[PDB]
Design a binder for this molecule. Structure first.
Ligand SMILES: *[C@@H]1O[C@H](CO)[C@@H](O)[C@H](O)[C@H]1NC(C)=O
Ligand SMILES: *[C@@H]1O[C@H](CO)[C@@H](O)[C@H](O)[C@H]1NC(C)=O
Length: 348
């Protein structure tokens, strides 16, 4: 009970957790498992107390009877808000943007249209819109929904890659990294800017960044924000400035999760742990850093500024929100989780 057992996924996280444990003087200790699903099970089973999960996993742990403890507060990825512990920063906005000059285009007029995605299986670029598209329709065949798309990471033979176009030489088509020209936020946005796609699924921050002189890239630079609208779920459209009222869903901050019975205590422990090892912590560079990893995002995301208070005791569905929940629930209906299945079994 006094200790808090963390669940690491992989040897790289395991190693980092071991150094944490050591430095914490054994108040934090570590269970390791091969998959995230396996950790949620350990926690469900009381053999581990906590770990930190992404949105899809919060949903799934949520359904199995786990709850969010502290939210991972971003910085912006560099830059500013404060103070970090008391207020959770909202979490970025997934938007669907289309050219203003195209007005015969709405959230309900997207079938057989052309789509530009950031990547397959990303939150803003894939998971939220396709999750919601299939809410709209009731089919799991979102793959057949757009006539053509650029969805980096999908099958290159398929319609979902038909719009990607690799790099200068056309090489590495539909690859899920920067080498694919319409990869990521910028690329998805360029895909719409050059009218290769009808709709681009990005975040609010994306059009601001590539319009009106934020970017100098030859494709971006003479771009105008005027020229782009946002597709809201009420079927209307609005300017890019109004993302807060015209988005698909919020992309959830990663969060620590726990048995409700243990939430108070793991919380209490981590607040002190980050005072020791967090961004201003007594001991960070000096002995150990909670939000730095020798590889990438081990245990927490590297751009995490602190763990922050919920205020308080939200369920998963109140943490994620109705749109995000509808989104993921739709995805998981279409491609099941063994764990979600397991959690619905009447033998647990
Ligand atoms: C949208 O993004 C821009 C750039 O990050 C920011 O200035 C603005 O506050 C954001 N708007 C909303 C509604 O979050
Ligand atoms: C889901 O579908 C209903 C009708 O099917 C719609 O009115 C509602 O806005 C949709 N919800 C989301 C979160 O997209």
């Amino acid at each position: 009970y006094t200790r808090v057992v963390w669940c690491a996924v992989g040897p790289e996280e395991q190693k980092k957790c071991q150094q944490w444990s050591q430095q914490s003087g054994q108040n934090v200790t570590c269970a390791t498992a091969s998959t995230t699903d396996d950790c949620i099970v350990l926690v469900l089973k009381g053999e581990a107390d906590a770990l930190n999960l992404d949105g899809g996993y919060i949903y799934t742990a949520g359904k199995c009877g786990l709850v969010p403890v502290l939210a991972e507060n971003r910085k912006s990825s560099k830059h500013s808000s404060l103070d970090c512990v008391l207020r959770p920063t909202e979490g970025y906005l997934a938007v669907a943007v289309v050219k203003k000059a195209n007005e015969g285009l709405t959230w309900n007029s997207l079938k057989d249209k052309k789509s530009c995605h950031t990547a397959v299986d990303r939150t803003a670029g894939w998971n939220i819109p396709m999750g919601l598209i299939v809410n709209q329709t009731g089919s799991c065949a979102f793959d057949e929904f757009f006539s053509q798309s650029c969805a980096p990471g999908a099958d290159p033979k398929s319609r979902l890659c038909a719009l990607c176009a690799g790099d200068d030489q056309g090489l590495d088509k539909c690859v899920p990294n920067s080498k694919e020209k319409y990869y990521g936020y910028t690329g998805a946005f360029r895909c719409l800017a050059e009218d290769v796609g009808d709709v681009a699924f990005v975040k609010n921050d994306t059009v601001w960044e590539n319009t009106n002189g934020e970017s100098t890239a030859d494709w971006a630079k003479n771009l105008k924000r005027e020229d782009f609208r946002l597709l809201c779920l009420d079927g209307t459209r609005k300017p890019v400035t109004e993302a807060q009222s015209c988005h698909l869903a919020v992309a959830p901050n990663h969060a620590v999760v726990s048995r409700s019975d243990r939430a108070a205590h793991v919380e209490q422990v981590l607040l002190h742990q980050q005072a020791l090892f967090g961004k201003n912590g007594k001991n960070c560079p000096d002995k150990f850093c909670l939000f730095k990893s020798e590889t990438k995002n081990l245990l927490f995301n590297d751009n995490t500024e602190c763990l922050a208070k919920l205020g308080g005791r939200p369920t998963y569905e109140e943490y994620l929100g109705t749109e995000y929940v509808t989104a993921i629930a739709n995805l998981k209906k279409c491609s099941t989780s063994p764990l979600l299945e397991a959690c619905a079994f009447l033998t647990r």
